[PDB]
Amino acid sequence: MLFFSFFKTLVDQEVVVELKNDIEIKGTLQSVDQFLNLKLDNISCTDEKKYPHLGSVRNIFIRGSTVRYVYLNKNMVDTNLLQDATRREV
RNA sequence: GUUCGCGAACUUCGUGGACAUUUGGUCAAUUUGAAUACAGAGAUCAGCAGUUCCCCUGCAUAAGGAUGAACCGUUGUUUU
């Protein structure tokens, strides 16, 4: 519920998502749910070989388990609030 | 006395003017114990940068504005 909240707080965000099977895709995050899935608007290029065989796909739904990271910058994410939340929880 | 003019028989008589003078004119230079010299030793043409003041142009520093750029940021067996 902490992490879900955090994800929600990142609504409307151009972020790169590296998947398990060598798939790195950029996109503007829209919807966030209990199991941490990502629907990204406007799919753009990150790398040439790793980026998968898509083109006209402008909207996607990433399965939450298959993500390795969610590549944020240092100007795109919460931190000591998260820490506080963690502390509060057991 | 010395010249120029005119009257009478170049020559001479009768005659009217004019007749000072010197200072102010030393080549220097060198060889002398008068000779050599011989007037005395860079020119002209043309660039460029400098200096000052201005104007433009580009950069730098100071300051001081104006404005842009998407989008949210931080304190009982499949997604654990």
From Swiss-Prot:
Output the InterPro entries linked to this UniProt entry: LSM_dom_sf, Sm, Sm_dom_euk/arc, U6_snRNA_Lsm2
Which Gene3D superfamilies does the record cross-reference, listed alphabetically? 2.30.30.100
Give the GO molecular function terms: RNA binding
List residues of the Sm domain.
2-76
Fetch the SUPFAM superfamilies from UniProt.
Sm-like ribonucleoproteins
Superkingdom in the source lineage: Eukaryota
Q: Where in the cell is it found?
A: Nucleus, Nucleolus; Cytoplasm
Task: Summarize the impact of K20 to A/E.
Answer: Inviable. Decreases binding affinity for U6 snRNA
Q: Which residues form a coiled coil?
A: none
The alphabetical list of record keywords is: Cytoplasm, mRNA processing, mRNA splicing, Nucleus, Ribonucleoprotein, RNA-binding, rRNA processing, Spliceosome, tRNA processing
Example GO biological process? deadenylation-dependent decapping of nuclear-transcribed mRNA
Q: Give any Gene Ontology cellular component.
A: U4/U6 snRNP
Any extra detail in the entry?
A: Present with 2210 molecules/cell in log phase SD medium.
The UniProt entry's sequence similarity note says: Belongs to the snRNP Sm proteins family.
Q: How does it assemble?
A: Component of the heptameric LSM1-LSM7 complex that forms a seven-membered ring structure with a donut shape. The LSm subunits are arranged in the order LSM1, LSM2, LSM3, LSM6, LSM5, LSM7 and LSM4. Except for LSM1, where a C-terminal helix crosses the ring structure to form additional interactions with LSM3 and LSM6, each subunit interacts only with its two neighboring subunits. The LSM1-LSM7 complex interacts with PAT1; within the complex PAT1 has direct interactions with LSM2 and LSM3. The LSM1-LSM7 complex interacts with XRN1.
Q: What does this protein do?
A: Component of LSm protein complexes, which are involved in RNA processing and may function in a chaperone-like manner. Component of the cytoplasmic LSM1-LSM7 complex which is involved in mRNA degradation by activating the decapping step. Together with PAT1, the LSM1-LSM7 complex binds to osmotic stress-activated mRNAs to attenuate the osmotic stress response, probably by limiting ribosome access to the mRNA and consequently translation. Component of the nuclear LSM2-LSM8 complex, which is involved in spliceosome assembly.
Name of protein: LSM complex subunit LSM2
Q: Which organism is it from?
A: Saccharomyces cerevisiae (strain ATCC 204508 / S288c)
Gene encoding this chain? LSM2
